[PDB]
Amino acid sequence: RNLAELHIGQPVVHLEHGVGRYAGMTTLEAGGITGEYLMLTYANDAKLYVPVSSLHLISRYAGGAEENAPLHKLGG
């Protein structure tokens, strides 16, 4: 997956935590690194941000029943 062309609500796996629900994109301005970031939502509406330079760490679920794809939690 090249990401970016992702579908809203699409189940995608984060190599760090696992399957989550993709939700649009957010732009983040860090001290040094500013740019476009991926926005993901996990259990308890946990917000995940993934840099567009780390997209290849994200994978699309692609199991079959994408609507019944599970949802992991983040440790906020």
Side-chain angles (χ1 to χ4, degrees):
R1 232 295 178 211
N2 65 330
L3 294 304
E5 299 174 80
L6 289 145
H7 174 97
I8 303 300
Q10 181 175 90
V12 290
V13 293
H14 189 207
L15 73 316
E16 292 183 58
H17 266 241
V19 57
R21 292 294 176 171
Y22 184 78
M25 266 180 173
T26 177
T27 346
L28 303 181
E29 299 173 282
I33 310 83
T34 66
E36 297 175 77
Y37 291 72
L38 164 155
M39 225 180 64
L40 252 152
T41 35
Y42 283 65
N44 193 266
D45 287 77
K47 307 292 184 173
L48 171 65
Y49 309 116
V50 177
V52 290
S53 191
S54 303
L55 293 177
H56 288 257
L57 300 179
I58 309 290
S59 287
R60 190 179 56 140
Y61 197 88
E66 306 303 281
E67 298 305 302
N68 292 90
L71 188 61
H72 279 203
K73 186 188 177 187
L74 302 178

